[PDB]
């Protein structure tokens, strides 16, 4: 990894563009006006890419050679980078102040600030914008996952009277559906801020290495079938496949994909009749989890529940909602995103089915179908020092008032009613509000403040 080659190309030319005599460039990150965001992921980026000796004579020579060919000209700031190498043993003369990780902040508030600590390195602040802006992804995954937890919490409480099993209601199936191995780990870890069920193993190592938990692992899974383990038995032997799998995992929960040929037939005739004797004998701690995987998500769920309700003893809970026996549950793991999740639980409630009957699996919808535009995650310069005088800087496009940026030195405060406010133009220096919620997390190549994954989880908790 070479930090000199980890920026947008045009940034290589920006040191020549700033006003002459600029000693300080101060920039901030916000999710511009999903009403609130989970702040998560910066700690991973600081440790992996920004801390320690990030500059070497070899890295400078390597970058010089690449940029000479890439621009077909000598534009690369070799003097500036050689200065950091000689003066600071290749450590970044940068200060990063950030809100604590797991903090739930309303939109349009400062989440972190970046500034150079040496006047010669005025250009460094925005050089590292590209690396830092990538924190949009764990922020958005964590925020979207938490919003789905809010929907599940609302309907589980309404249909059952409690939140039992809530942290296992949305399982991460997204490993194959993401753009890379690195994305898989970052995304899976952001989902684990809110839930405990994951199939994306990559998230486990990332948490252990960069955040840490008191528990041996942050996430869990159970044995489950896939189309290949069912279809390898042959079309006429689906019953033999099901019997073998539930017998191999007789004492643990087991999920079985039942839609290879005909989901309604598997529920009614295979599970509901032929293998019913292997289901009713199961423990409350080892249910069979029927998994539909195609068709209209809501229509399939309701039809599967009506079939199961007629083949198995259904009870009515204290809220008047239908509950399957404890050895039988359903997992819907196809076509699940925040919109369809809401349609399913609302459809179940209208048909008097408790949310305790169902769990969800989400792949692409959870980890890939998200962009930086969803929460409007943006990094902009708000303050510069030129000829020793500080000036408030901002953009305000005529055609888009929503793109107007904040001015001057920023701070985040608790209001008297306990909400959040971002103070602009260094107004935080007037002690009219409490202490600034931003802490120095990075300074001069060192990580100065860290959070464990348990602290993040506590900070990201729902109000309910
Ligand atoms: O069905 C299941 O029930 C619960 C345990 C995991 C599981 C399925 N996992 C999965 C992973 C990646 C793609 C598809 C499914």
Quoted resolution (Å): 2.0
Q: Is the CB of 289 under 6 A from ligand 1?
A: yes
- Shared domain for 384 and 404, answered yes or no, is yes
Q: Are 282 and 247 in contact (CB under 8 A)?
A: no
Contacts of 20 (CB under 8 A, 6+ apart): none
Query: Do 82 and 181 reside in the same domain of the chain?
Result: no
Q: Spell out the residues 6+ positions from residue 357 whose beta carbon is closer than 8 angstroms to its own.
A: 305, 322, 323, 324, 329, 330, 348
Measured CA to CA, the distance from residue 40 to residue 8 in angstroms comes to 23
- Taking CA atoms only, the protein residue closest to ligand 1 atom 11 is 173
- The C-alpha atoms of residue 253 and residue 229 are separated, in whole angstroms, by 17
Cβ atoms of 204 and 395 within 8 Å: the answer is no
Do 170 and 302 share a structural domain? Answer: yes
> Is residue 223 domain-shared with residue 298, that is, in the same domain?
yes
**With a 6 A CB cut-off, is 322 part of the ligand 1 pocket?**
no
> Measured between alpha carbons, how far is 137 from 83 in angstroms, rounded to an integer?
33
Q: Quickly list DSSP for 98-165.
A: EPPTT-EEETTSEEEEEEESSGGGTTHHHHTHHHHHTTHHHHHHHHHHHHHHHHHHHHHHHHHSS-TT
What span, in angstroms and rounded, lies between the C-alpha atoms of 311 and 136? 47
How many angstroms separate the CA atoms of 15 and 460, rounded? 39
Q: Which domain does 37 fall in, by range? A: 1-133+372-450
Q: Is 331 in the pocket of ligand 1 (CB under 6 A)?
A: yes
**Read out DSSP for 238-272?**
HHHHHHHHHHHTSSS-EEEE--SS-HHHIIIIIII
* 151 within 8 A of 342, measured Cβ to Cβ: yes
Q: For residue 272, what are the CA distances in angstroms to 60, 134, 398?
A: 68, 49, 64
**What φ, ψ does residue 430 adopt, rounded to 5°?**
-80, 115
Q: How far is CA 460 from CA 62, 139, 143, 149, in A?
A: 42, 11, 9, 11
Query: Ligand 1 center to residue 299 CA distance, Å?
Result: 21
Structure tokens given for 438: 């931003």
Q: Which residues pair with 224 in a beta bridge?
A: 255
34 CB neighbour count, 10 Å cutoff:
14
- Alpha helices for 163-312 (secondary structure H): 181-191, 202-210, 227-231, 238-248, 263-265, 276-279, 297-311
Is the same domain home to 458 and 354? yes
| Same domain membership, residue 266 and residue 197 | yes
* CB crowding 109-139: b at 16 or more within 10 Å, else e: bbbbbbbbebeebbbbbbbbbebbbbbbbbb
Provide the 3-class DSSP secondary structure of residue 68.
helix
| 426 phi-psi bin (left φ>0, alpha ψ -120 to 50, beta other) | left
Spatial contact of 102 and 458, defined as CB atoms under 8 Å apart: yes
Residues contacting residue 238 through CB under 8 Å, at least 6 positions apart: 230, 260, 261, 266, 270
Statement to judge: residues 100 and 141 lie in one domain: no
Compute the distance between CA of residue 111 and CA of residue 142 in angstroms, rounded to an integer.
15
Supply 227's token pair: 């189309």
Do 168 and 104 reside in the same domain of the chain?
A: no
Solved how?
A: X-ray
How far apart are alpha carbons 175 and 136 in whole angstroms? 19
171 within ligand 1 shell (Cβ under 6 A): yes
List the CATH number of the domain containing 330.
3.20.20.70
Give the pairing type, strands 110-116 and 22-31: antiparallel
DSSP 404: P
| Residue whose CA lies nearest to ligand 1 atom number 12 | 173
For ligand 1, whether the C-beta of 333 sits within 6 Å is: yes
457 is in an annotated binding site: no
Give distance in angstroms: CA of 125 to centre of ligand 1.
Answer: 43
Probe target for ligand 1 pocket from 245, 361, 364, with the most ligand atoms within 8 Å of CB:
361
The count of structural domains within the chain is: 2
Three-class secondary structure of residue 460 per DSSP: coil
Largest CA-CA distance found in the chain, in angstroms, rounded: 84
Cα separation, 367 vs 363, in Å, equals 6
The span from the CA of 199 to the CA of 220, in Å, is 8
115 and 28 together in one domain: yes
Q: What is the dihedral of CA 143, 178, 29, 395, to 10 degrees?
A: -110
Evaluate: CB of 221 within 6 angstroms of ligand 1.
yes
Give the residue, out of 328, 333, 362, 367, with the most ligand 1 atoms within 8 A of its beta carbon, to mutate for a pocket test.
333
Q: Is 8 annotated as a binding residue?
A: no
Pocket test for ligand 1, best of 255, 330, 358 (most atoms within 8 A of CB): 255
- CA-to-CA distance for 43 and 165, rounded, in angstroms? 29
The contacts of residue 305 (CB under 8 Å, 6+ apart) are 322, 324, 330, 348, 351, 353, 357
> Which residue minimizes the CA distance to atom 15 of ligand 1?
173
Residue with tokens 């802490």: 439
Report the C-alpha gap between 142 and 44 in whole angstroms: 14
Specify the residue with its C-alpha closest to ligand 1, atom 3.
Answer: 255
Burial of 407 (0-12, 13-18, 19+ CB in 10 A): middle
- 197 vs 188: CA distance, rounded Å: 10
d(CA 372, CA 133) in angstroms, rounded, equals 9
Is ligand 1 within 6 A of the CB of residue 368? no
Q: Is 170 helix (H, G, I), strand (E, B) or coil?
A: strand
Q: Show Cβ contacts of residue 209 under 8 Å, excluding neighbours closer than 6 positions.
A: none
Our answer on whether the CB atom of 447 is closer than 6 Å to any ligand 1 atom is: no
Ligand 1 centroid to 213 CA: how many Å? 24
* Best of 176, 178, 187, 199 for a ligand 1 pocket test (most atoms within 8 Å of beta carbon): 199
Q: What is the dihedral of CA 251, 255, 259, 262, to 10 degrees?
A: 30
Mark whether 310 and 455 lie in a shared domain. yes
Q: Which two tokens stand for residue 161?
A: 């009277």
Whether residues 240 and 331 fall in one domain: yes
Task: State both tokens at 247.
Answer: 């017998």
Three-state SS sequence of 414-456: ECCCCCEEEECCCHHHCCCCCCCCCEEEEECCEECCCCCHHHH
Query: Could you give the angle at the alpha carbon of 22 between the alpha carbons of 19 and 27, nearest 5°?
Result: 95
- Residue closest to 54 by CA, chosen among 440, 444, 379, 441: 444
Do residue 217 and residue 344 come from a single domain? yes
Helix 136-160 vs helix 338-350: crossing angle, to nearest 10: 0
392: left (phi over 0), alpha (psi -120 to 50) or beta: beta
CA distances from 401 to 371, 372, 392, 404 (A): 21, 19, 18, 5
Q: Cβ(255) to ligand 1 under 6 A?
A: yes
């Amino acid at each position: 990894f070479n930090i000199l080659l980890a920026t947008d190309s045009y940034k290589v030319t920006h040191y020549k563009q700033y006003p002459p005599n600029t000693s300080k460039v101060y920039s901030y990150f916000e999710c511009r006006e999903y009403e609130e965001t989970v702040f998560y992921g910066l700690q991973y980026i600081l440790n992996k890419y920004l801390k320690g000796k990030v500059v070497t004579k070899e890295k400078i020579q390597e970058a010089k050679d690449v940029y000479k060919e890439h621009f077909q000209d000598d534009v690369f700031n070799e003097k500036g980078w050689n200065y950091i190498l000689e003066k600071y043993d290749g450590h970044l003369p940068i200060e990063i102040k950030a809100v604590p990780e797991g903090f739930v902040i309303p939109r349009g508030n400062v989440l972190f600030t970046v500034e150079n600590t040496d006047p010669e390195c005025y250009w460094l602040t925005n050089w590292i914008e590209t690396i830092l802006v990538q924190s949009w992804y764990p922020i958005t995954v964590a925020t979207n996952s938490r919003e789905q937890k809010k929907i599940l919490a609302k309907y589980l409480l309404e249909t059952s009277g409690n939140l039992d099993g809530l942290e296992y209601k949305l399982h991460d199936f997204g490993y194959r559906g993401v753009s890379s191995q690195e994305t898989a780990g970052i995304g899976a870890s952001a989902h684990l801020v809110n839930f405990k069920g994951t199939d994306t193993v990559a998230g486990l190592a990332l948490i252990k290495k960069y955040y840490g938990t008191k528990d041996p692992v942050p996430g869990y899974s159970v044995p489950a079938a896939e189309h290949s383990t069912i279809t390898a038995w042959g079309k006429d032997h689906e019953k033999d496949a099901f019997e073998h799998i539930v017998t191999q995992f007789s004492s643990v929960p087991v999920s079985v994909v039942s839609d290879s040929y005909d989901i309604y037939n598997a529920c009614e005739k295979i599970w509901g009749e032929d293998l019913r004797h292997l289901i009713v004998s199961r423990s409350t701690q080892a249910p069979l989890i029927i998994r539909p995987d195609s068709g209209n998500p809501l229509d399939t769920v309701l039809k599967v529940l009506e079939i199961l309700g007629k083949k198995f003893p259904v009870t009515e809970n204290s809220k008047g909602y239908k509950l399957l026996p404890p050895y039988l549950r359903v997992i819907q793991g196809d076509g699940v995103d925040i919109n369809t999740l809401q349609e399913i639980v609302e459809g179940m409630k209208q048909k008097m089915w408790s949310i305790e009957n169902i769990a969800f699996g989400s792949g692409g919808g959870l980890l890939q179908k998200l962009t930086r535009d969803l929460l409007n995650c943006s990094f902009k310069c708000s303050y510069v020092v030129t000829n020793g005088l500080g000036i408030n800087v901002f953009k305000d496009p005529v055609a888009d008032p929503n793109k107007r940026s904040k001015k001057g030195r920023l701070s985040l405060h608790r209001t008297p009613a306990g909400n959040f406010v971002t103070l602009e133009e260094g107004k935080g220096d007037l002690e009219e509000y409490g202490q600034d919620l931003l802490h120095t997390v990075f300074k001069n190549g060192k990580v100065t403040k860290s959070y464990s994954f348990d602290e993040i989880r506590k900070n990201a908790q729902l109000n309910i």
